[PDB]
């Protein structure tokens, strides 16, 4: 195994409530240790480890660099946000919903219905299980939100149940991309 | 606890190669990366190529300063080399699996470091190159990375898969099996 020397620089913007609260943080990393950084909440470069004093000192001693950095909260963060607003933040991809039985392998002496909500964006989402006219609160288990990497999310919600003739199950999905919720139904025994 | 997190500058540069990466991220996804050799910005969505533009030259200039910085910090740290991490591999389908219906397998390689990895696919024990694809290295707050590989495929009862991951942090190639149960 060869030796590797890795360097990382991250220019990060943190947004809360539109652009009401904006925080800028630049991070300098050697391998995996952030040795120096700049956080807009404080306003000056900081040596985070004993590996950064030569850096923080160098940059803090230069007037235009401190000012220019401080200004990046606007020229970079607030600036790009405007581009993010009419693109990313308004992107809407409806989820396709599917219901299918557990299969086998035993779901714990108790059958399982799997409601898979796929290919949606943004992340915000609400999934609910119904048995006839009542909502299922217990016996419901969900996988964490899953990131496909292609700008789409996926999530799986199983419901513990016992197939009984007559009973009807539905999966209700609420997402910012649809005015009406998506409702899929599965009928036990048929 | 922020409503949105963005990295308008995920810059990487390694002595191994040497190699580097320049990309932008928003809420954990890659907006684009700059092909360093071709000096061309590669956006990740049609929506982005249509409404936004980023000068590739800026990526090259930053990366050049990172090289300048790395050499200096290698000396300052008495040449402290990076530690290899054990990759976590997870394979899963993009869409519910229905035989005969085109789908895509997703192979997530988490906790990667350093950012040097070999992710390939196997179809019934044979190497598969067609329909294979992958994201760039996505950042992690802990400073490691994660990369996701794709394999478009036709669900078949007579076909199974394995995501092959090669990383110096592994005693030997890792294989995560997967098949339409």
């Amino acid at each position: 195994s060869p030796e590797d020397f890795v360097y990382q620089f991250k220019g990060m913007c943190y947004f809360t409530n539109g652009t009401e609260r904006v925080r800028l943080v630049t991070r300098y990393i050697y391998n995996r240790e952030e040795y120096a950084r700049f956080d807009s909440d404080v306003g000056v470069y900081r040596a985070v480890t004993p590996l950064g004093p030569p850096a923080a000192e160098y940059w803090n001693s230069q007037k235009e660099v401190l000012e220019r950095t401080r200004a990046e909260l606007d020229t970079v963060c607030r600036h790009n946000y405007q581009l993010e607003l009419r693109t990313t933040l308004q992107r809407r991809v409806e989820p396709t919903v599917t219901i299918s039985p557990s299969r086998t392998e035993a779901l714990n002496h108790h059958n399982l219905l799997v409601c898979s909500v796929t290919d949606f964006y943004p992340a915000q989402i609400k999934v609910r299980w119904f048995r006839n006219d009542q909502e299922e609160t217990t016996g419901v288990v969900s996988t964490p939100l899953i990131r496909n990497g292609d700008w789409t999310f996926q999530i799986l919600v199983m419901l513990e149940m016992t197939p009984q003739r007559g009973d009807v199950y539905t999966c209700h999905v609420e997402h910012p991309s649809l005015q009406n919720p998506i409702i899929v139904e599965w009928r036990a025994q048929s | 606890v922020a409503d949105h997190v963005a990295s308008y500058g995920v810059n990487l540069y390694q002595s191994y190669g040497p190699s580097g990466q320049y990309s932008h991220e928003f809420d954990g996804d890659e907006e684009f990366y700059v092909d360093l050799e071709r000096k061309e910005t590669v956006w990740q969505l049609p929506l982005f190529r249509r409404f936004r533009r980023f000068d590739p030259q800026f990526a090259l200039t930053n990366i050049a300063v990172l090289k300048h910085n790395l050499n200096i910090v290698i000396k300052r740290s008495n040449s402290t080399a990076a530690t290899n991490e054990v990759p976590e591999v997870t394979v899963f389908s993009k869409s519910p699996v229905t035989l005969g219906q085109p789908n895509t397998l997703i192979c997530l390689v988490d906790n990667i470091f350093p950012p040097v990895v070999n992710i390939t696919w196997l179809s019934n024990g044979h190497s598969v190159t067609e329909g294979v694809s992958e994201t760039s290295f996505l950042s992690k707050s802990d400073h490691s990375f994660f990369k996701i590989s794709y394999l478009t495929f036709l669900p078949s009862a007579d076909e199974i898969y394995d995501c092959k991951v090669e990383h110096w942090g592994l005693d030997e190639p890792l294989l995560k099996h997967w098949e339409p149960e």
Partner: peptide
């Protein structure tokens, strides 16, 4: 209208 970026500061070379 075009994307902006942070400029990584350069360590002092001796």
């Amino acid at each position: 209208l075009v994307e902006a970026l942070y400029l990584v500061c350069g360590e002092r070379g001796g």
